[PDB]
């Protein structure tokens, strides 16, 4: 029998909930194949597996948040000390965004804002082709680059020594990474998609976070082209299962 947790450390948004069901819905749809069994707890709000079950989930899914990495609230502490006996145990552990920062931050690395400032788009990554086995959870023909969809106002400032850097961008060194075989982190959101997306936009304008100007440049990254959804399943999924193509 195969089990994953997904800590979910946001809350469900209106649009998600209405449109998705919510975000576990969306992780499951992402990620999740028939037959197997995903139990999802909202770290954000305190609620935890108990430690002694953690042997029995066969991987973990960290989403990402509107919280900061670098913060101190208790349901972070806890997080990082979870994550930590989880990466003591070798389990597979995929980090997105919030999650790639928060593994990042166990092992010793430093999460703040972006030096570039905030991303709200659909964007490319450049993948550092040298450090990608043909074959593997990247699998045969590794793209030069890969679409993803970027929602963040935080990155990795000093990364782990242990981590391997495996794409970065012009403005953001670090947009994915692998630590040993077990930790697999994204900058990005291979979950979101352009409705996802478009709702955080308006509602970020709506607040007078962003001018009008930004929130049409994040849109009009949207407007003739997609993420590459496929094969970032195809990656999660590799990874996260130990498939191997």
């Given at each position: 029998?195969?089990?994953?947790?997904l800590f979910l450390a946001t809350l469900d948004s209106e649009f998600v909930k209405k449109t998705y069901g919510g975000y576990h819905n969306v992780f499951v749809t992402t990620?999740?194949?028939?037959?197997?069994?995903?139990?999802?707890?909202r770290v954000v709000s305190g609620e935890f597996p108990?430690?002694?079950?953690?042997?029995?989930?066969?991987?973990?899914?960290?989403?990402?948040?509107?919280?900061?990495?670098?913060?101190?609230?208790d349901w972070i502490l806890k997080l990082c000390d979870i994550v930590k006996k989880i990466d003591e145990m070798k389990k597979k552990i995929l980090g997105i965004?919030?999650?790639?920062?928060?593994?990042?931050?166990?092992?010793?690395?430093?999460?703040?804002?972006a030096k570039k400032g905030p991303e709200l788009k659909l964007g490319d990554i450049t993948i550092v082709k040298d450090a990608i086995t043909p074959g593997s959870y990247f699998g045969n023909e590794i793209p030069d680059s890969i679409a993803i969809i970027?929602?963040?106002?935080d990155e990795v400032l000093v990364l782990p020594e242990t981590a391997k850097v495996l794409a970065y961008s012009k403005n953001y060194?670090?947009?994915?990474?692998?630590?040993?075989?077990?930790?697999?982190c994204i900058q990005g959101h291979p979950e979101y998609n352009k409705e996802i997306?478009?709702?955080?936009?308006?509602?970020?304008?709506?607040?007078?976070?962003?001018?009008q100007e930004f929130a049409d440049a994040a849109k009009a990254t949207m407007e003739n082209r997609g993420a590459d959804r496929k094969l970032w399943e195809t990656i999660c999924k590799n990874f996260l299962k130990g498939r191997v193509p």
């Open positions: 029998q195969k089990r994953y947790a990620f999740g194949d028939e037959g197997e069994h995903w139990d999802s707890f108990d430690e002694k079950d953690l042997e029995k989930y066969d991987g973990f899914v960290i989403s990402g948040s509107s919280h900061d990495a670098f913060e101190n609230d965004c919030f999650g790639h920062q928060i593994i990042a931050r166990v092992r010793g690395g430093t999460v703040g804002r970027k929602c963040h106002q060194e670090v947009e994915m990474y692998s630590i040993e075989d077990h930790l697999f997306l478009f709702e955080i936009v308006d509602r970020v304008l709506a607040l007078g976070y962003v001018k």
